[PDB]
């Protein structure tokens, strides 16, 4: 029973970690779009 409890506890931590990872992934995605846009803007500026 104790072991089971421990496992359960671990699971929550794991879940939290996963959530964090997803958040980070989202952030990364957001950044990438900006970079894509930003590069284009830079190019435009150069042209001008």
């Amino acid at each position: 029973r104790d072991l089971e409890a421990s496992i359960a506890r671990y699971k929550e931590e794991y879940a939290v970690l996963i959530s964090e990872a997803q958040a980070i992934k989202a952030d990364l995605a957001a950044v990438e779009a900006k970079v894509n846009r930003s590069t284009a803007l830079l190019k435009s500026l150069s042209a001008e």
Binding site: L3, E4, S6, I7, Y10
Partner: peptide, 10 residues
Amino acid sequence: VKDQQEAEKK
């Protein structure tokens, strides 16, 4: 997983 295995054993 390890914990689960242990539980199974015991």
